[model samples]
Target chain A: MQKAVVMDEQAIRRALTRIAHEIIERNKGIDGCVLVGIKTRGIYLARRLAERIEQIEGASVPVGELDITLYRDVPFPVTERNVILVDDVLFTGRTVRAAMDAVMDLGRPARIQLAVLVDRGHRELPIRADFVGKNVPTSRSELIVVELSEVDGIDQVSIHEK
Target chain B: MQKAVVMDEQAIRRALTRIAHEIIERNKGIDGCVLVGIKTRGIYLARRLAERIEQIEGASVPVGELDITLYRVPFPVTERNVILVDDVLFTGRTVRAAMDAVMDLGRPARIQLAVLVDRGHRELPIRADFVGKNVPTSRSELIVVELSEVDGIDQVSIHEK
Candidate 1:
């Protein structure tokens, strides 16, 4: 199957900006909130969202990247704070479940939420993204590719057959 | 007395690109090289450098973020070429501590330092192997590197303290 571009650079920027605003608005100003980006591509998105939140709220929030390949504890402290997980794509709930367990291993948080750039529905567990850039209902045989400028030299999303 | 933007978005981008090229050239193409970005800003810069090196050399390099506040190191460094990255080259204290932390991890084949802006006030006998820009600065002036990854924009600014 031929790949098709779904989200471009501007779309990503706008989506992140909107997510940042939504985060602040939903949380009532981002105080005591922290962002944890699941490693590889999600780390950059988490950092970008942190900057955007700062731009909106005039305060900086802590951001950390989690390597859940081991499903181990977080490097930074997250005890008694609002923890938001950021990722590039949300396909299965398995990764999120592992990430939640990883976060729990570190310390107990006040609450846990999720924010993702692309949310393709395929549920193995009962998990949902609190904030989604695009709700891409992909077929089981299709693939969602997210290219981030930090790693891929561009910000875009595409779909292709597996 | 006022904040001056020395390097804008494009300037910083070009500088990193140049530094990436220099890194590849100096190391003869990043074969065993790994990049460790000093935390806060260096982390993002390290990732960007890794991407650039991949673009230039067609190989992915390991990138790690070091928090010299604690002076702890992650990832194995033994027998590997290491490139320490930071936003500003200042009093040399941070880099020195970072070197100590890396040594504590494992013995690397080689270790080189890279900085976006080298403000000349090195108290130790340390110099960066790769420098994006060198602004001859005084003790009172400050060099601020606003990375797009964390600052919502790209800029290198100078301010009076």
Candidate 2:
């Protein structure tokens, strides 16, 4: 039998706000940065972050969704520009590698940065997130699930022990 | 100065009929063949050929139009066993290359051929017939013009020396 681990919505909101500030501070003010959400949930997070950056810096940042599936080298066609790969969780780094191949077909970006809600370690590849919400240390079998209001009608992260 | 090369209505009809017969004979009937036009003029030629083949064989043949400008790799898309790339003329190999690019996107038993006019010698190794008319000329010059209403009032062509 599986048990549900409840996450505090308030805590997730505070963490997002802190991460938003950190993104602006580290980039020196969002001058030439663009946010690209890696299809499904990351799209909403990218938009949210863009909105937050607009509010904080009084500048509108561009946001776009990337469908890395069907890339000529992968599973679908690759289209679009300078992309900041966003995801709800950063795990084995396989998805990120696939996304990189997809992005290559769309012309080289100024930079490719990884932004994640949770970075529960046990990475197979040497990939690190440029902006991380919470670094919850865990083993390889543990799975981190992020629920965003845009997708699940809630905002939170839960680790399931397998 | 440029002069017009004239081909009458009867001549045009005869040319198409001969090409239709040639296609049937060469391919052993249009049983597994598919004709794809290269947009604009080529599409009309493909449709006409399909219609003629249907009339002669007393059966329906597959005909399709291809807009190759925006394909991700090359070629539009198709499901026919064999493909015949239809075009009006073979110019500088641009259209030929476009057809080859389109063919790269699919699997076909064979890519047989056809064309409306063989103006003269081609820059590329491409040739065609279903040829309405063949006008021999210099190495640097060639011209082909076509019209559905092949009557006197509906057609015109001009060539410069």
Q: Highest lDDT: give the candidate number.
A: 1
TM-score of chain A, model 2? 0.83
CA deviation > 4 Å runs, candidate 1: A71-74, B1-161
Q: lDDT by residue for model 1 over A42-151, one digit each (tens)?
A: 99999999999888889999988888777422376578787899999987555776676677678867666789999987653235677889988889899999999899
lDDT of each: 0.82, 0.62
Q: What is the C-alpha RMSD of each candidate to the true structure, in Å?
A: 21.3, 19.3
lDDT of 2 by residue, B24-92 (tens): 886787777777766666666677777888899987767666675664233334444344444345442
List TM-scores of chain B, every candidate.
0.95, 0.75
Instruction: Please report the candidate that would top TM-score against the real structure.
Output: 1
True-vs-predicted CA distance for residue A12, candidate 2, Å = 1.8
- Model 1 lDDT at residue A17: 95
Clashing pairs in 1: none
